Amino acid sequence: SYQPTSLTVASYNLRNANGSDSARGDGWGQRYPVIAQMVQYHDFDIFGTQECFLHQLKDMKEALPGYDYIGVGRDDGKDKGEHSAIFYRTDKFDIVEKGDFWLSETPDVPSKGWDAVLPRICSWGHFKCKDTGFEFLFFNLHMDHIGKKARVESAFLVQEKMKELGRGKNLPAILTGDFNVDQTHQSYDAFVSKGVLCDSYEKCDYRYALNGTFNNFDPNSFTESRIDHIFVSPSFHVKRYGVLTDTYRSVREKAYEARTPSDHFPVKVELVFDLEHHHHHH
Amino acid sequence: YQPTSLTVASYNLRNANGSDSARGDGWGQRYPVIAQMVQYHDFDIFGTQECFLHQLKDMKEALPGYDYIGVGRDDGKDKGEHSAIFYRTDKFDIVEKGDFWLSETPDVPSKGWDAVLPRICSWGHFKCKDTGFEFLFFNLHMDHIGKKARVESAFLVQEKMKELGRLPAILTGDFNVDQTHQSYDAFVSKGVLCDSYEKCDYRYALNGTFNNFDPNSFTESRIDHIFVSPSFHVKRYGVLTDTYRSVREKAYEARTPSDHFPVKVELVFDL
Ligand SMILES: [Br-]
Ligand SMILES: [Br-]
Ligand SMILES: [Br-]
Ligand SMILES: [Br-]
Ligand SMILES: [Br-]
Ligand SMILES: [Br-]
Ligand SMILES: [Br-]
Ligand SMILES: [Br-]
C-alpha cells in the first residue's frame, strides 16, 4: 500500500558571518546556537538555508546531530562563497540524486546571469522518504538583488529544471529561498501565475503570520512584504504556514535587549502528500 | 497497545484592564494573537490564569474546537479571575471536574493564611478519546504576598491530588515566585511531582516566564511551571517568545501577547 506522507519544511536565511554584524552584537557565534535550537524545537525535517559560508555550515551541522547538508559554494562550485545549502534529517530521507546550477545563461559554470551583479546558485536534492518511499525534489536558492531580468529568467530556469530533474517522471517539487523582492514583483508572478507552483502563504489551510520575512536584525520591525517563500507543486496539500518570530536576549552594552537569531525570520510550512490521489483538475 | 502523547501548556493571559489598554497592551488587541498561538503551537490542553468570564468567552469564540472548565474565584460562579483549563473537545471527554480555594477552607471562596486575595485551583479528570488514557489536570494562580499561603497551598494541592487521584497528574499555574523559593521545593523535594524544565529530554528556554509586557526583558526566574507525575515521560519543554507588532504612537514596536510567555510541554505516557 501507499501511505500518505507528512513533511515539515522551512526556508531560513541564516545571514553570512561578517565583522559588521559581530560589532553590532548580532555576531554569528552568538546567533547560531539559537538558530540550531529553533530548527530542533520547531521540527524542521528538511530546510533550505541562504548566505552560509562553509565554516557556518560546519557549525550548523555540529549543532544539529542527525542532520546533514548538501549544496556547493556559489563562487567556485566548491568551498568558496555563500551557499544555498539544504539541511535534512538523515534518519528520515535518503538522497537519490543531488546537484547545483547557477542562475544564468550558463547554469553549469559559476557565472553571473543576465543583469545580475553576483553569481547566484540553486542547490537541489531528489529525496526519498525512508518511511513511505515518497520521492520529491527540493530546490533552494538566493536571488540577485539588482538584476530584475535575472530574477525573472531565474524563475523560468528553475521551472525548466523541475521538469528536467524528474528524469522522465513527474516528481513533485518544493522550492525555498531568499527571493530578495516581495510578492508584488514580476519574479514572484513568474512562479505562480500559471499554477506550476503554489505559494504556501496563499494555499495553506492555516496561516500564522505575525510578520513578513525580513527583519534587518530589528526586533521591532514590521512589514507585509514576504521575500522568503516556500513554493510547492499543486499536488502537495499545504496544511500550515508560520513565520517564527522567536527572539533571544543579550546584555545591553543588568539591562537586556531582544535579538533576532537572523536578519530574516524562518518560514515553516507543514505539507501532506497523498500518493494515491494528488491531482488537481477544474 | 498504543501510548498516549499530549501537548500541554500554562499561560497567564493577563486580566483585562484599562491600564494595559492605555499602554497599548489591551486585551482586545492581544487575545486574537494568543488564540493563534494556542492553535499554531498545538496545545491539546492548557491551564490559563487571570481571565474574567468575558475574556474566556472571547477565547472560546476564537478557539472553536475548544471548551474550558473552571469557575470564578470571587463567588465560585461567574465572578472574578479564573484558573480556567481549556481543552480540545475532539481529544478529551471530561469524566469529572471541580475547583477548590487555596486556603484553610478549600470548599468556599476564601483567602488563605497570609494571602491578600482569594486564589483558586481548578481541575479536571480527563479521558483521552484515542487511547482511553485518564489523567488529572490541575491549574492555579498563587498569591503574590502570602509566603505561608504559597507553601501551605503546595501541600493542599498535593493532598487534593491524592484524594482525587485515588490517575497520573499534571499541574500548571502561575506560582508567582521562582524556582529558588520554598513553595517550589514543597512541590518537588519528595518526588511526588517533577518540574518539566528539569525532567525534559529537550529544553528550549530563551527566557524565563514573566516579561512584564517588555519585549526586551530577560530573567532566569521561572514563575510559571508545569509539574507532572514521575510516571510521565517529558519529551520537550519550550518557552514561546513569539511577538506581534503594533503601530508606534509607519513605525512599529514589538508587543508580547501577554505579560508572561507560555510554557509548552510535550508529554508521553507509555505502558
Ligand atoms: Br568558509
Ligand atoms: Br517523513
Ligand atoms: Br522582479
Ligand atoms: Br523590514
Ligand atoms: Br496537480
Ligand atoms: Br466578566
Ligand atoms: Br480551534
Ligand atoms: Br515561597
Side-chain angles (χ1 to χ4, degrees):
Chain A
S1 66
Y2 295 89
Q3 303 307 318
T5 299
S6 292
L7 294 175
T8 295
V9 304
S11 182
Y12 202 178
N13 180 328
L14 305 196
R15 184 58 174 163
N16 73 262
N18 65 87
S20 294
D21 283 336
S22 296
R24 291 185 284 270
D26 296 306
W28 174 247
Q30 172 173 286
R31 295 193 289 106
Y32 92 74
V34 184
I35 294 172
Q37 282 223 278
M38 296 187 64
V39 172
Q40 296 175 313
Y41 187 81
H42 288 103
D43 297 320
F44 298 175
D45 292 336
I46 174 157
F47 59 106
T49 65
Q50 308 83 41
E51 293 199 29
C52 287
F53 291 113
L54 178 60
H55 75 271
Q56 295 180 79
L57 295 175
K58 284 173 180 175
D59 296 342
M60 288 294 308
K61 181 171 179 186
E62 173 181 61
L64 291 175
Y67 285 82
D68 212 331
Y69 64 84
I70 54 177
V72 307
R74 75 186 183 183
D75 284 3
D76 69 348
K78 296 178 292 183
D79 294 341
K80 285 187 175 53
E82 300 187 0
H83 295 66
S84 295
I86 298 160
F87 282 78
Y88 65 101
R89 286 195 61 164
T90 59
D91 70 354
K92 282 178 197 269
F93 309 96
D94 285 315
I95 288 171
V96 178
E97 221 196 305
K98 67 173 171 168
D100 316 82
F101 57 94
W102 282 262
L103 304 176
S104 73
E105 302 90 323
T106 60
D108 249 345
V109 309
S111 47
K112 301 171 186 180
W114 306 274
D115 61 352
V117 297
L118 272 42
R120 304 289 182 164
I121 197 177
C122 175
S123 300
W124 61 272
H126 174 168
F127 291 88
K128 182 174 190 185
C129 301
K130 288 184 168 179
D131 51 5
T132 65
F134 173 53
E135 295 184 40
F136 62 98
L137 295 169
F138 194 107
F139 292 84
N140 179 48
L141 59 75
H142 185 172
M143 294 287 215
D144 192 71
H145 57 301
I146 299 308
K148 182 182 197 310
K149 179 171 192 204
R151 293 191 298 266
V152 177
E153 296 285 348
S154 288
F156 292 109
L157 165 61
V158 168
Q159 293 165 242
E160 291 299 286
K161 290 290 171 178
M162 289 183 163
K163 286 176 287 183
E164 175 179 296
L165 301 175
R167 312 296 189 197
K169 293 183 314 184
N170 186 216
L171 292 184
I174 299 172
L175 166 65
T176 60
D178 177 345
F179 296 79
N180 252 140
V181 301
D182 77 8
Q183 65 273 20
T184 67
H185 293 252
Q186 189 175 356
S187 57
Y188 173 92
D189 300 342
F191 292 105
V192 297
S193 75
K194 306 303 179 187
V196 174
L197 291 164
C198 301
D199 184 355
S200 294
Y201 174 89
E202 299 290 348
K203 301 314 177 187
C204 60
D205 295 332
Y206 191 95
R207 182 191 294 152
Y208 182 49
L210 301 177
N211 219 314
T213 68
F214 186 58
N215 63 58
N216 199 32
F217 280 124
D218 176 3
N220 296 109
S221 74
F222 179 79
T223 184
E224 291 185 288
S225 289
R226 312 185 307 278
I227 67 175
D228 303 281
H229 304 293
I230 299 184
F231 295 108
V232 300
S233 302
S235 54
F236 284 103
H237 184 69
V238 181
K239 303 278 292 182
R240 189 156 63 178
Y241 167 104
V243 174
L244 312 180
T245 60
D246 306 34
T247 48
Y248 72 103
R249 300 285 182 274
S250 65
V251 175
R252 246 193 224 287
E253 68 152 351
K254 304 293 283 297
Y256 295 86
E257 64 187 287
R259 292 280 179 184
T260 57
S262 179
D263 69 341
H264 295 62
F265 296 124
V267 171
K268 169 183 162 168
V269 169
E270 290 149 275
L271 300 172
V272 177
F273 191 92
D274 183 334
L275 194 284
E276 295 290 347
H277 306 282
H278 46 80
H279 209 76
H280 286 245
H281 182 279
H282 275 194
Chain B
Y1 173 78
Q2 53 176 182
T4 298
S5 296
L6 309 176
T7 299
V8 304
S10 178
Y11 201 4
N12 182 327
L13 304 194
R14 174 67 163 177
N15 69 265
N17 63 82
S19 304
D20 283 338
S21 297
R23 292 188 290 263
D25 300 306
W27 176 248
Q29 174 171 279
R30 302 190 290 100
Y31 88 81
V33 178
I34 293 174
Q36 280 220 276
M37 288 183 74
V38 168
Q39 294 168 320
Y40 186 75
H41 287 106
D42 293 328
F43 294 0
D44 293 324
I45 174 174
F46 62 104
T48 66
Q49 307 83 41
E50 290 202 26
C51 290
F52 297 116
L53 180 55
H54 81 271
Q55 299 180 78
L56 296 172
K57 177 186 300 69
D58 289 341
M59 288 296 301
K60 205 188 184 308
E61 181 177 24
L63 293 173
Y66 290 76
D67 202 349
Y68 70 86
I69 58 183
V71 305
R73 69 184 187 186
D74 288 357
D75 69 350
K77 299 166 185 184
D78 288 347
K79 294 179 190 172
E81 298 177 3
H82 295 66
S83 297
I85 294 162
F86 282 79
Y87 66 97
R88 286 186 59 160
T89 55
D90 59 350
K91 289 200 178 187
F92 312 97
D93 288 295
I94 299 172
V95 179
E96 185 179 5
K97 67 184 186 172
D99 317 81
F100 58 90
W101 284 262
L102 298 174
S103 70
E104 304 96 312
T105 58
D107 286 5
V108 289
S110 49
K111 295 171 180 167
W113 303 279
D114 56 357
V116 292
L117 291 171
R119 302 291 176 163
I120 201 180
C121 175
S122 295
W123 63 267
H125 170 173
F126 287 91
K127 185 179 189 63
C128 297
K129 287 172 169 294
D130 64 331
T131 62
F133 178 65
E134 294 177 27
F135 62 94
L136 289 162
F137 197 102
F138 288 77
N139 176 51
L140 57 74
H141 187 179
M142 298 283 220
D143 200 67
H144 57 306
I145 298 311
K147 180 175 183 301
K148 188 178 183 183
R150 290 188 303 264
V151 171
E152 299 282 357
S153 290
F155 291 111
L156 168 64
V157 169
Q158 287 171 250
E159 173 192 329
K160 294 293 194 178
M161 295 176 182
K162 280 225 312 295
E163 169 199 325
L164 303 171
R166 199 177 311 175
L167 304 170
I170 298 161
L171 162 71
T172 66
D174 176 350
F175 296 77
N176 239 315
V177 297
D178 74 11
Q179 67 276 8
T180 71
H181 290 71
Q182 174 74 44
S183 56
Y184 173 93
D185 296 347
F187 284 111
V188 304
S189 67
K190 299 303 189 300
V192 179
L193 290 166
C194 305
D195 182 2
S196 294
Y197 176 92
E198 302 287 358
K199 179 154 186 175
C200 61
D201 289 344
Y202 187 92
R203 176 190 301 155
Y204 182 48
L206 303 182
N207 217 316
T209 66
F210 180 61
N211 65 60
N212 199 40
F213 277 128
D214 181 358
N216 295 115
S217 75
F218 179 80
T219 177
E220 309 218 319
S221 291
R222 310 181 313 271
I223 65 175
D224 303 281
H225 308 288
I226 301 189
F227 293 108
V228 304
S229 298
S231 56
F232 280 108
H233 179 357
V234 185
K235 296 286 262 167
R236 189 156 61 180
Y237 167 102
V239 174
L240 309 179
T241 59
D242 309 32
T243 49
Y244 71 103
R245 302 287 184 269
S246 60
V247 171
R248 218 171 69 218
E249 8 138 90
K250 329 203 69 171
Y252 297 85
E253 58 186 294
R255 293 283 187 174
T256 57
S258 185
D259 64 348
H260 292 62
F261 294 120
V263 175
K264 164 180 169 176
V265 171
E266 298 154 74
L267 300 174
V268 177
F269 185 90
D270 204 338
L271 298 182

